[PDB]
Amino acid sequence: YSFSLTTFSPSGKLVQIEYALAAVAGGAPSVGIKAANGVVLATEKKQKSILYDERSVHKVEPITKHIGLVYSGMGPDYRVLVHRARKLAQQYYLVYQEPIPTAQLVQRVASVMQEYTQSGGVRPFGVSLLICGWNEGRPYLFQSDPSGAYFAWKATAMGKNYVNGKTFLEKRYNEDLELEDAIHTAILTLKESFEGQMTEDNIEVGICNEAGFRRLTPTEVKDYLAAI
Amino acid sequence: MNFSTLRNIQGLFAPLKLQMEFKAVQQVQRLPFLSSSNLSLDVLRGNDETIG
Amino acid sequence: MFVPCGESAPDLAGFTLLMPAVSVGNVGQLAMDLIISTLNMSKIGYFYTDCLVPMVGNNPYATTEGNSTELSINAEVYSLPSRKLVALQLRSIFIKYKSKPFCEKLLSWVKSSGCARVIVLSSSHSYQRNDLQLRSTPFRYLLTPSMQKSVQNKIKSLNWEEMEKSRFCIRIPGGGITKTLYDESCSKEIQMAVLLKFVSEGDNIPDALGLVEYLNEWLQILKPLSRWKIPSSWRLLFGSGLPPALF
Amino acid sequence: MFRNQYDNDVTVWSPQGRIHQIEYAMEAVKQGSATVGLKSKTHAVLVALKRAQSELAAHQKKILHVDNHIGISIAGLTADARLLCNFMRQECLDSRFVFDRPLPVSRLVSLIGSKTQIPTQRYGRRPYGVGLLIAGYDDMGPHIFQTCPSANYFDCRAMSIGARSQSARTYLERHMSEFMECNLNELVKHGLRALRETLPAEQDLTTKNVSIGIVGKDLEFTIYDDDDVSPFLEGLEER
Amino acid sequence: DREVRLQLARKREVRLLRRQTKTSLEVSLLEKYPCSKFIIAIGNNAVAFLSSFVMNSGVWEEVGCAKLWNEWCAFCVFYHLKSNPSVFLCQCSCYVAEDQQYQWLEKVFGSCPRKNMQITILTCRHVTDYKTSESTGSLPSPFLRALKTQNFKDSACCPLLEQPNIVHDLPAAVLSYCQVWKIPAILYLCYTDVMKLDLITVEAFKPILSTRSLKGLVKNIPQSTEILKKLMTTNEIQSNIYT
Amino acid sequence: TIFSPEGRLYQVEYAMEAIGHAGTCLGILANDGVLLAAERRNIHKLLDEVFFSEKIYKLNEDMACSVAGITSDANVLTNELRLIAQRYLLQYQEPIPCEQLVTALCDIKQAYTQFGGKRPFGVSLLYIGWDKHYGFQLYQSDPSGNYGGWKATCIGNNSAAAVSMLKQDYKEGEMTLKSALALAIKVLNKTMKLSAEKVEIATLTRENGKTVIRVLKQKEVEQLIKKHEEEEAKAE
Amino acid sequence: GTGYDLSASTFSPDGRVFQVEYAMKAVENSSTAIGIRCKDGVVFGVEKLVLSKLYEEGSNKRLFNVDRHVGMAVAGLLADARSLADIAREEASNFRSNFGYNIPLKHLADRVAMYVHAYTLYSAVRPFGCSFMLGSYSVNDGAQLYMIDPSGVSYGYWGCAIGKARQAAKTEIEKLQMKEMTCRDIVKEVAKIIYIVHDEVKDKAFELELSWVGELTNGRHEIVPKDIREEAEKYAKESL
Amino acid sequence: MFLTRSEYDRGVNTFSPEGRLFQVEYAIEAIKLGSTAIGIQTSEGVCLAVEKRITSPLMEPSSIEKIVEIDAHIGCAMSGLIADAKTLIDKARVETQNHWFTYNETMTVESVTQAVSNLALQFGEEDADPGAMSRPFGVALLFGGVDEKGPQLFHMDPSGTFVQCDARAIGSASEGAQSSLQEVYHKSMTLKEAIKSSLIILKQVMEEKLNATNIELATVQPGQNFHMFTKEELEEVIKDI
Amino acid sequence: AGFDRHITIFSPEGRLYQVEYAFKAINQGGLTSVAVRGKDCAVIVTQKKVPDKLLDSSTVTHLFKITENIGCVMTGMTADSRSQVQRARYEAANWKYKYGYEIPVDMLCKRIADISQVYTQNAEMRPLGCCMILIGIDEEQGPQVYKCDPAGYYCGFKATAAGVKQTESTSFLEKKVKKKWTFEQTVETAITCLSTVLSIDFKPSEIEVGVVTVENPKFRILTEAEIDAHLVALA
């Protein structure tokens, strides 16, 4: 209902960042829940036809032994950011001879994202990232916007119908939630407003523990869906 | 495998295209400003997945 | 000040005035040229002011050797008393701090002469409204609350689209004096209608043709169909000839 | 009316298939005074005209020396003329200093055209705004060449460039059938007569507004100025 | 602020003074003296033509001058013949901006127009401003073109200006004023390829000498030719930009 | 990067106008300490009680700052401040003066308004700290690169009324931490209904030759607002 | 394409690049040139207009010699054509130096077409405004004919025409049986077509330029002798 | 038949339809805001005279230097913006001193001219970095020296090229000064006559009164070196008038 | 000036219209391509049009050989497609030089997509208006079909189509794949899909067919006689 050629919106924010957020809000839903021991990440991987090959590309990607992430927005930007995140983690490990903390990696990725909001002749990234990690026996969960502003959460959702997902999470969250219950709650949140039949091939689930981060095999996803 | 080999195999156009792409991407450059990361330059140069 | 070409000015009671606006692309001026050339109006006087840059030339609508040597100025008035129509044409540009006085003087003349209604042809930038521009028609209309109810009913029957408001005030970027004219007509209670189009600078003959067809859908100055006489002065719109020893 | 959007940059094509900046640059040649060049079976002659102002304020170098067998005359922008003259001098000097042999005039002109074509295609640059007449002698004999801001060059029997050179061109076309058999004196007389056509009906050639450059067989390029043009000026008839 | 705008407006005013007394006239110039003929020249070449071929005979007395300031501005002096006080002559050698043209018209002409007054205007334009189907450089410049009002009984000595070509600025302002207020007038245009002080450009105005307006003001040609030839030898020094 | 015909910087003016729509921050200097008070515009129950847009950052053990503007630019500037302080400490074996740190950041902020083709930072700062040269201090900054010392100031939304009330109810050399906190609560309530969960309070002081920076708890904020309510009820 | 036609890095709403289209339109204000591939060679023909009588005969040539065995005919901007000819010469020389044998016409056409296409992607340069054809002959390869346009597309042809009147020339060429003829008849056919598609009133007097490369020349590009040109011109004039 | 706006004076690489460079023309026009300078070269030497205008009695006249000494045999006079000529003067001094220090000869006036002109044409260079000069210099110069070819005089304008001359005047009153010089200069005149004529023309064109404090004068001779007149010499010469 | 004239400017709804226009530019060619993967083979079939009778038909093709074991079919602008093919060959050579073994199909497709992504985030260069489909055989995975687009998005398929009539081709292929292939059945399926979608009876000189097989892992282009034999067998 309004198009602006200026830099700052009348509400006091950057116009291009608002447009990038509008682009992000039209993507596939994503859900992240932090439990007492571990973090669970989930996303919707609905495909347009049976002609596709689900074993080709993945939306949940691991950065290192203990860090993984998921996105909601434009695929190519996520692909170009994942490689930079992995390179930064490897550089930190080479320099300091120790695994990078989650907060440092989030800070560096956010700085890289912010760099593109000030220069001329470029455009900001159109993605929002959810990052999970494990440090000193304590799970972490972060969310970053296209402008590079990050906050730490306990349960959050983005993409389509994220307000209803946030309401659902607020209504059905507990401080002493277990990993299995967290996975069940995340799958239920994804099932809410799915407009279809959920199988073990059209969703992706990843978990983080004290043993590291890994992506669930579709057999395990089918087993989890059997309980529901 | 370098610019001379590419010119001898394909022609004069390939190194010219590569250098024009490099110059167009490198326009984000200034001395009195803060440190910068050359994401697009590393992607085009092909060294975005290796550590020097 | 209206200066008649003859001795005494004619009467314009119950007449409708067609007016252009100096906007982006000169679409209104080109449409006025098309209308005057096709409908074959005759000069009746001049609108002498001090707000437009002076210019002079011969007859732009010459059709024979006899009338091809008539001088013309930057603001002239034509009329067709058979169908109660009067037209104004501007062939120049405005000087600084001289648009509002021109609008005030023109509306004073419109009130004093006894005209019935005013129609303004204008244009606006084609890259500044919304994503709705790319998936909708490029024609918009505006109306004054003083307009007759029959006109409103006819416009609603024609299935047109009204110009969107801006947060509520009317904003027409690249429209020239059309916003000032609309505001002053609303203040002075004068029936005014505005028809515009989203364009870009370049070759704008199809834009003028589309605008005159859009106007004809309502006024029906020609036969109702999907035709227009091109003036003889549309000759060298891109310049002179090509120099030799290049191609 | 519609030319506003397409006549500001050299890298923008018009919808008619034209580039207006090249034509505008070619229009800058007529801002200088006129020059005349002609050749015979054994000689090549350049004749130039100096500005009508006083000589105290400025001394003008209209005819320049490039090599022992090449000389040029200029009309247009002084900076562009200086750049082109330096380029030609460097090319000729390199050829001699390395290979111990003179540089062919056709090769030099081709190099000039190739160099001048470049700025007509890049962004943020403008075409050269100077015109050249080149006279030289080599194994193939005398030569007269003309260069254009549009990076085009021509081979001529006689040519005139500058301001109001159409009358000189008409005279050269009318009298071109007898240049081959003329000797040096008659060739210079023909050049002066052609150059005189660009002046008002009352003015006449004078030793203070005429420059002459001559190259030919067994004669290196030489520039005659001031009192040196008196032998050539003597013998001319009334208009 | 409004103060800077007011200062700028006051800095660009037009004043009609009298250099004999250095006092500005409080009444329009034409409202003080009767007029029957009025000749106006704009530019270097037209001023030189009038000063060489017309103002070399009789006694001409100055009655006023105009003062103005632009980023491009040079004088504007008015004369009238002593033997015939009803014949006026103006020589504008400066540039009048678009916001000063109507001030100039008001100062010179006023709000009260009168009939029985012929007006002739002379000016020059570059040949590149001409529009033609063929190339610009193939035209035999310089040439002469004319525009007239609707009550000019006489005929021009040159072909009328072709259609897609238009004229603006001060000559257009004067012609528009004359056309609106029903005053006979004519404008002469010289399209030339040399816009500086040139002998051929000045001599391009010769056919106008045989018209009825200038019939009684030209006495002898050779003296005018000698004066013009002497005058052409005092031109300003040019820059080192061209060669 | 372009001078207006009247001699003004449109980009800087736009940045300041945009900052004028941000949250409200407060700073009051007392005889024995200095405090910062901010407004929490956004809040959710699901935040992780850390990195929850904590507007009071800690640069060193002696200094702290508050931000009203773009969060990412604020993060960049704070990170740069931390590196500057650490580098100076490593070089000189001595903590950096607060004014020197502010000047170092202001030089970077000013360079962007003169060089290159990048937009300036749309962030305003508020620094509090202690050093042996001058003791307790309080500074301010703006996108143009200007800075100055104050005794009580406010930035953000409705800052003019807060400044007017501060200048009306502020007395030099007679106020302590408790009076400063009460005045800050009154000003924030007037400029914002206020809830104890919508504000953040931080204080700086000295404890046996050691700078101590603390953030007030929800219970303490509730106690303070209850005392203010009791006082305003007793007044009427 | 108003609003999307000021740069070569912009797409039209219907998926078009208008700067390249304007560059291709810039070829239509140049004199027409044709080329016909025959059983044992290729013949070129150019309609050349005379500018003035002060120019020496043989100047402003539009039929170049790229190498010992390659002929070239251009149309459009002359300076762009000369630069492209220099590029082609450099490529042929490099291939000769490296691989030790003459470059096939297909590879040369591909290299030059890619070089031309490289100028239609960025906003720092402008597309070329010329078109040209290449011809060659060999004992083990036969006759070859190619075309390159400003967009950067190259194809092989049996008969080609570029310039202002390419449509009428192509219509005239379509009526020929060049697959079974010889060069001695193709020269006359080319002269007749050039004389037919010429406009006498709009354009002034012209001169005819002809060339071939083929078996009777032993794989060399040369100029037609004067007697053959005179006979072909007489035949064309008497037929027209 | 419509009047529209069109501008061609926005950049330095744009040609007008008649083939002109309006930015360079404006840079040249900027010289009209400077003071008047006069330079005359004869068979015995070169004479330079300049006018310095003091805008307030509180200003110090000694703080205005419009005639400088490049070397022992070269002098210069400025007109326009004095701040722009500093780089050119420094470049000329460095070139001359370096050449002497390296080879033990003296550069020619033409060589110093070329060295200076290389820097003044930095705008419009093929590969000039954006951090260097991007606009024409707003100053005009008048070089005068004695070489083995005899006395020489050169003139430079914001265009960027030097031109040799015999008697040139620059500044606001350049037209009147040149008109006066035209009827005075001749080939057989001497240095004292040149000094007297230049002082007479300066007095004629100056709005103030010639009082040997608001002017400067210098001469270069083949025998002696660059010499600048003092107050006593200026008064002695002026009292002749 | 405008949200659709800039490649590096988002629209209020978060869209990049230059990429959409580049997608629209693919249909300018007017041709359709179909790729079908079998049990142990991959088949690509394209449509050939040679309207001019003065044009040498041997010089018109859309099937390319990137590597001795990798094939390709291009849809869209001809010059852009040829430039893309040259870039793919250069990238394959560089990968082989750097890593000592031949590049896989998925890695080549990923590299091409990564290169294409940069053109969408910088304003001084424009995307290429072409679509690339690659086929090959992996050492431990079998036949593979991959596809690119101007936006920088890539994925693996069992069957896909590009150009005009892509929606109809996908609708036709969906039912066949759901219903549920030997070497003869894959070629027959692809040819039948193209013929039914185009509503034209094909001739041996009107199409191009390229295949790859597990037994013979080298890319091969079928001849007119083989295409005619396949057409006779189908009919």
Author numbering:
A (entry chain A): 6 to 233
B (entry chain H): 62 to 113
C (entry chain J): 1 to 167, 177 to 235, 244 to 264
D (entry chain E): 1 to 239
E (entry chain I): 34 to 106, 119 to 288
F (entry chain B): 10 to 201, 205 to 248
G (entry chain F): 5 to 244
H (entry chain D): 1 to 241
What's in the article?
Previous work identified five CP chaperones: proteasome maturation protein (POMP, also called hUmp1)29–34 and proteasome assembly chaperones 1–4 (PAC1–PAC4).
Together, PAC1/PAC2 and PAC3/PAC4 bind all seven α subunits (zoomed-out views). PAC1/PAC2 is perched atop the α-ring, on the surface recognized by proteasome activators. PAC3/PAC4 sit on the opposite face of the α-ring (that is, the future site of β4–β7 subunits later during assembly). Consistent with the structure of the orthologous isolated yeast Pba3/Pba4–α5 complex, PAC3/PAC4 occupy the α3–α7 side of the ring, with α5 binding at the PAC3/PAC4 interface. Lastly, structure 1 reveals β-ring initiation with β2; a PAC3/PAC4-bound complete α-ring engages POMP, which co-recruits β2.
